[PDB]
Amino acid sequence: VDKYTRARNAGGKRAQDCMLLAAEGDSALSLLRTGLTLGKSNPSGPSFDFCGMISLNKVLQGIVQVLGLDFNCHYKTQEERAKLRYGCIVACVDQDLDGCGKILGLLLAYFHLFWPQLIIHGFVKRLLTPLIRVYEKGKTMPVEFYYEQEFDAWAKKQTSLANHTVKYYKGLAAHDTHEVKSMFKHFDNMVYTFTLDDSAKELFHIYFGGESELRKRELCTGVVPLTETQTQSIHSVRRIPCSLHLQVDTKAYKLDAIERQIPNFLDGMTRARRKILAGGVKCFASNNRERKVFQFGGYVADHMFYHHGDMSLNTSIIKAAQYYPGSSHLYPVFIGIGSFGSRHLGGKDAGSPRYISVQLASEFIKTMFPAEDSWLLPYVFEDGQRAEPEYYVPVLPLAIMEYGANPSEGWKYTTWARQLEDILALVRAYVDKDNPKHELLHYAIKHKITILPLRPSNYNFKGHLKRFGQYYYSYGTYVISEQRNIITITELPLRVPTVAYIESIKKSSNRMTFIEEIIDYSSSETIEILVKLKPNSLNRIVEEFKETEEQDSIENFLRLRNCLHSHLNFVKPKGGIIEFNTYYEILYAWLPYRRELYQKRLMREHAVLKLRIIMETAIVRYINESAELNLSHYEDEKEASRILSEHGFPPLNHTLIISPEFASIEELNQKALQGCYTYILSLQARELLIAAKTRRVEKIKKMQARLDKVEQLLQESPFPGASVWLEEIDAVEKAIIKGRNTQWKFH
Amino acid sequence: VDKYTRARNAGGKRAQDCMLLAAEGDSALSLLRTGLTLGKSNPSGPSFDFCGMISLNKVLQGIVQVLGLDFNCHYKTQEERAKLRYGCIVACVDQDLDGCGKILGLLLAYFHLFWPQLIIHGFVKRLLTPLIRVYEKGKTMPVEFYYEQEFDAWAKKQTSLANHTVKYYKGLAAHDTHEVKSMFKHFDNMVYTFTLDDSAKELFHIYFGGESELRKRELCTGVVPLTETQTQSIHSVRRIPCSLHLQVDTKAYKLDAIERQIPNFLDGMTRARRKILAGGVKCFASNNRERKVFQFGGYVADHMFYHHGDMSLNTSIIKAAQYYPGSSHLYPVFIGIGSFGSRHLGGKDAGSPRYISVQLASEFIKTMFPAEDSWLLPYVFEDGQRAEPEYYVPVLPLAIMEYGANPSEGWKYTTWARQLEDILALVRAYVDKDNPKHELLHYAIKHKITILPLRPSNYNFKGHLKRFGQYYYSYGTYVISEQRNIITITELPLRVPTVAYIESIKKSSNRMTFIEEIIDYSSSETIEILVKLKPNSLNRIVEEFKETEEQDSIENFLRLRNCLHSHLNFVKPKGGIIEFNTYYEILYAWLPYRRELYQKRLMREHAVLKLRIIMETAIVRYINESAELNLSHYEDEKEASRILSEHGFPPLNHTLIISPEFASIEELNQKALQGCYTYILSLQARELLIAAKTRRVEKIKKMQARLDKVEQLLQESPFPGASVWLEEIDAVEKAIIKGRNTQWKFH
């Protein structure tokens, strides 16, 4: 067997004392080799005298061959087990979702399917490695945690983490050489044994069986973290229940795989698209200069922790910067500068990422996603670093205002964008206090009924939308020239590529008996396809493809019909998969999430406003009293701070009060008043002038007026921030109108 | 033909008036479609009434089929040409090296090989597009340049470029929609015609023929830019000579392809490795925190314009961060944190980029590549943005101090690292004024002779190096255990992977007749391979593989011999390929480049030192006179600057004097004294204290002493900066020793 290293006693008298270390890949094999050949010191550590290696179907067949297993045996007796060359198999896979959730889960499912008795009595093991290590400055022995719950619980009891650094080891390749030495020093303590319980059989049949309905039922709930009692139990007994592993790690892997293709219902974007939007907001905030697609993709991968390859990242950026009839985004995030694709090839004809550049639609992004509300969203922490937020809460329900189509592993996601006017009317009726049927909409939301209609978006569509039964249909347009005996196709159904449509028409021989030649003469936006028919066939086409009520004979001939199928599957904010029936439900579910955000916005802005008022008042007082103070007479920082303290100047946190980027209201109240005199001692010479003093006084008056206005808005009815919500809705509508007027190029 | 659109009159009465637009790809096809269907305005513009499209072997066969060409025809008469369906073929390729240098060159070579008369009388055309566009703030009509020489010449005559923005269009996908409209408005003016001259046949046979020696001769010189007279001629006559295109664009493409695999002799790194090193220096300058491989690759692609895929970038970063016996880098740039690879698989067993992290070797990089010398190197400008420098000039000849092996398109590059001690001795003898045979080394350099020897690096090699004839050989080590009848391999030849060696031994049946089993029991660094022989074969092995003077019988048996072949092919600083014979020549060629850099360093530091002395003197004067000035009494910035001017304070450029990042000596002398009073008006309140004043006075005294020392160093013999060079050599040696002592992990 290739990439297999045997031991001295494998298959010998003490073969039962041997071990087989199943490595995930080449890096795992290198780590195992480094650990095993380490036996020049600490002789108690493992070596090749009893431990072999193997790399992880042909792979499972090889593992069976090295293990000397028999497919016709059940291994219910010790004598039957004695024929095995190795006493146990240990899987050395990484702690990430792809390694321990997929490969280890597949190995466990295979062993349970073929030899359950080996798992029951104990034959399959895994090598737990320290997931998180905390290093103390000056201390040589780190604090090692095997689960994130342990690290979190330990951190809650720590006074301060300033002198502590946290390193996450989710992969076997992330362990340094000295850490590998330390791990293989205690190797005998870090290997656990799998145990099969009663619920484990059912859990295995749910995750790895052919029963898709049970899998969909199981994936409807988020990941359940291991309880502290369970963590203590597994650490004490040195045994992993198979059911617990399947319920935690495999479920997390499956939910992460599904989450990549199915977006949240609050913002209508997946994790990758959320990362891209956050990176675009961060990059183009200072200056909205054009940046190339590969450069911006590198920036996103650097800042928002986008570990996937550059191909998918560049494709997603291009798709987010695309704007053409039938595109996925009716309101794309980025302004495309160059050739980003055409409707004929479905956007796949975009230019190379090295040539096309991307620019952020500042007027649309700054209004739809307010910058002041970005500090209140829950953020995703990747290895201790703050990545993109868990979900965006835009001013309007972006999940239903844009086209979407993404298949999944069993699930289907397909949405057709609703009309902007109807959504705006519904949201305004919900928000506006004095507006017809405003209380009626509240009653409708309370009793889950619909009053105002939602219609599919007819923009960028030179056709007519018709409803029949409970489904929507989009029709194309055609003209007939009897003189030349041709049919000119002027518009295709919604989201139908021109090249794909032509190929589908050509691939049908029956239609080809009547069609002589098809030429694509369409523009970039306008469709013009000339179909030449054979002599004396138009009457035959009408006779064969009989005209029906649903579609005309020509429409049946040319496949000028589309079905607006809608599968409203989305991801809940706290994990899991949620299924909606109508877009009304998505709107009514998204409304409270945004309604609750304005109150937090207003309270945080009130507290921060008080803090800025205090600081600017103190600064203006120092500006007025600088001549009396004569700060240059004092020697160092300590004496200056002391004399500033004698004059009653309050000590404030300069860094946090000015920039409370992610501080809560309680944090602001408890910490912002425990700083130093930097706010005075760091004032520049140009700020001592009368012009700067007058500007600061005017700013203080404006902040006081804004504080009073914030109090009034907090006292507003029905909910705080209703008028602010209406103003933001109007701004978003104006930005969308300006974008649509200028081909989504704000010039 | 797939992806082909015909015209109305193609093959008709006016078929000679038709055109065939050969597009490079899907983006070129989209641009051509947008331009052709644009004919709703400006009817003089081209349309589908006379212009068709086609996408660019099967491709050439398709082009021939649409053109209706005959392989048995020469097309020497107009009547023969009249049978053609299209009057001419126009290649729509991008202006970059890969598009117009490779695809267009290949098409021209094909047409010249098969139908030269079509090129001679005129049948192959190309579509020139504006490469560079300059936009004036407030002006609607940009200034379009088709070559970089035109833009450079226009820029030399401009007073200031602050109000001008420069956009480079090297790809067809980089043209915006309005720019595409403007281009197709003048389409009839922007299409040129290819002409075949006498030297064009020879140039075609050199570039596309089978004569590799002529290609190597041609690639020995850098790219020759088009002369201004030639540019005016081609713009006036609307004709591109084939010889000029081959000599410029194809030569540039070939030189860029070769340059990617062959490094410069001044620093021993290719363009990608130079970009990676510059990005690492820029990223880890502020803080040397660990960063993941994919994150750092994204940062490099964002900052240093690394347009290649993330796979190659991550592989190169991993290779630059690798450290193991037989690795490419004896002194790797980055400190590898994790599993970056082992000698058994040649470094291909590295972990995933998502898990392993990279850290910059600050102590080695800051000493080998001085930060003060990074401002004087010539930099590469990518689309107007300053990318990595053209070449690095380290303290020591890094090109010959590290292993290297990179094949090329006809060329071979393979270097074996020389001993550090011998190189240090030679460089010190060159630099040190009072050192034995110092003048002797100068005479040797003058007359191109060798005095002190260079030997291959024996570090990290548990074997003996022997020289026979003019070649070097590396021998492995083995032991024989007659009791067990086995041979234990303890060390492999230089740069020989363990797995590859084992597979090569196994693949030889003759050696396998004597070998029963081979097991790999080697450590991460130490090799231990046990080879079991069949009974009574050791004497047979000795008898068959006869012992010779060069290698022992066992060494011939196990292939424990390597040949230290050296191909010293490098890239000149100003383009081209240079071939050396011995490492002595590389050292003697690299020495003057570094010798000349110290003088520029010293002069620039002298001028900058004078400027800092002036600014700090003025600042200290203002600190002393602040109480008298009473700056708070004046209203705005203008009045404060005026009163500061009355007191005789000099106006200096605060931004440039403090940070002259890329200003030459003449620029420093001419511009640094034409600023404002920001250096005084931006002083913080904490800087007015007596402690800050004392610190500034001490800094002024230190700067005066350093200015005197810089004058003394400029007056040094034999060349300025000799003592500084010796100090930097000692620092580099100490850093290398510290790295080698700590496994290249500076802890």
Numbering used by the authors:
A (entry chain B), B (entry chain A): 415 to 470, 502 to 1192
Quoted passage from the original study:
The viral type II topoisomerase encoded by the African swine fever virus (ASFV) is critical for viral replication and infection, thus representing an attractive target for antiviral drug development. Type II topoisomerases can relax supercoiled DNA by a concerted strand-passage mechanism in which the enzyme first cleaves one DNA duplex (G-segment) and then guides the second DNA duplex (T-segment) to pass through the transient breaks. ASFV P1192R contains two conserved domains, namely, an N-terminal ATPase domain and a central DNA cleavage core followed by a coiled-coil arm, but lacks the nonconserved C-terminal domain (CTD) with modulating activities reported in human topo II. Similar to previously reported topo II structures of yeast and human, P1192R assembles into a large homodimer mediated by two interfaces.
